[PDB]
């Protein structure tokens, strides 16, 4: 019955600046073995966990040099000597001694330079209409940081409550995010109007841009 506690819950790092993640245990992870039974697993977006460190400080097969694992007794630290874009994901500590308990996971994020989003818009399908509903989609394909304001305007009059947005996990190469807003209404209400606009605000823009399309 060991409890893992792990901090920080999340982490923003400039590419090539170090990163620390800490795991402290409710009780000692040392052993008769003279070994510390703690591992570090990292789970990239969409992947299964992958083994990084084990027995406290033994880097594992095919794991880059910049990861190290250190610590002893009740206190351990996974240390990235210089973080790269590939490293982005959730990190978990675990002790197997009794009885396979995980940390809560330091999510790791990459401090990228600002990047405005390429913005796209997509009108309802042929067949989605030929079935009586209309979803309008708005792509913000690559941008940084995450915080992006997608304002939907129908006939240049505001919309609020009928559309949901989804946000990609930080890219593994360019450290980008992406977002897919979907304006959803009947057709019926769709064919009540003409002008359909996506308006996007972001840290990296001069003016909120507006790609759009009319009925």
């Amino acid at each position: 019955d060991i409890v893992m506690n792990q901090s920080p819950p999340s982490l923003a790092v400039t590419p090539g600046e170090p990163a620390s993640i800490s795991c402290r245990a409710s009780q000692s992870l040392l052993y008769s073995d003279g070994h510390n039974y703690l591992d570090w697993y990292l789970q990239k977006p969409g992947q299964a966990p992958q083994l990084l460190i084990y027995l406290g400080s033994t880097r594992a097969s095919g794991v880059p040099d910049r990861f190290s694992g250190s610590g002893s007794g009740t206190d351990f630290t996974l240390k990235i000597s210089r973080v790269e874009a590939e490293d982005v994901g959730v990190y978990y500590c675990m002790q197997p001694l009794q009885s396979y308990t995980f940390g809560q996971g330091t999510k790791l994020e990459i401090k990228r330079t600002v990047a405005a989003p390429s913005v796209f818009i997509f009108p309802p399908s042929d067949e989605q209409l030929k079935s009586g509903t209309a979803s309008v989609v708005c792509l913000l394909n690559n941008f940084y940081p995450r915080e992006a304001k997608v304002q939907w305007k129908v006939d240049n009059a505001l919309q609020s409550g009928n559309s949901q947005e989804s946000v990609t996990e930080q890219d593994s190469k360019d450290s980008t995010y992406s977002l897919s807003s979907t304006l959803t209404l009947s057709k019926a209400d769709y064919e009540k109007h003409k002008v359909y606009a996506c308006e996007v605000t972001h840290q990296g823009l001069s003016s909120p841009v507006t790609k759009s399309f009319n009925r």
Binding site: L51, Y92, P96, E127, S135, T168
Partner: protein, 218 residues
């Protein structure tokens, strides 16, 4: 490649059972502690059960009594029997090799994992998706695939059966008020190589046997 391939997730009413398996590659499942770790939607990792080399198991509190880990050497496969399932069990399940042996000494970490197998404990009936094209701007131009109104999670989507990997974004699905999920998959593509190419999205939603392809012409 030493590797674990998982099979058979699904949807089940509570109280129901379900069997998961993993098929091992380049190592004998008989030669290792084999282990199951699950991940709830939005949550972290949770160890669920171990298979020792000698056939005896060890189970986590949340699960003792209802689950059994077994292996079949002849099929070099690992199994987890999931009985009297409840909503709390709804998760992605990972089989993994525990490269260890406390009969001898050395521990080498949990170094091989299955891709994760999803289990939906729910009373709703499986709702399959509908796949809508998303046809097209700069020097490059985007296109995608809308997949809408399905239960339960998840869905499999690719571009031309694995072919188109780069500049793809399959988005987290959103939970509509209707009860059903909707998700969008889109791919950034050079406007240069315009519609003179055949861009097919490949949607697969296992809980109903539904597998679709789709050109996305403008």
């Amino acid at each position: 490649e030493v590797q674990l391939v998982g099979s058979g997730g699904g949807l089940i009413q509570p109280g129901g059972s379900l069997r998961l398996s993993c098929a091992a590659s380049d190592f004998s499942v008989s030669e290792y502690y084999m282990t199951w770790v699950r991940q709830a939607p939005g949550k972290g990792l949770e160890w669920v059960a171990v298979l020792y080399k000698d056939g005896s198991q060890f189970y986590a509190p949340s699960v003792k009594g209802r689950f059994i880990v077994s292996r079949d050497n002849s099929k070099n496969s690992l199994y987890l029997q999931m009985n009297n399932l409840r909503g709390e069990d709804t998760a992605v399940y990972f089989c993994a090799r525990e490269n260890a042996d406390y009969g001898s000494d050395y521990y080498f970490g949990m170094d091989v994992w299955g891709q994760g197998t999803a289990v939906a404990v729910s009373s709703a009936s499986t709702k399959g998706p509908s796949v809508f094209p998303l046809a097209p701007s700069g020097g490059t131009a985007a296109l995608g695939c809308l997949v809408k109104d399905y239960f339960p999670e998840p869905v499999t989507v690719s571009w031309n059966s694995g072919a188109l990997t780069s500049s793809v974004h399959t988005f987290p699905a959103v939970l509509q008020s209707s009860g059903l999920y909707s998700l969008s998959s889109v791919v950034t593509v050079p406007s240069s190589s315009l519609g003179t190419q055949t861009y097919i999205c490949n949607v697969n939603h296992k809980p109903s046997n539904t597998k679709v392809d789709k050109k996305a012409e403008p």
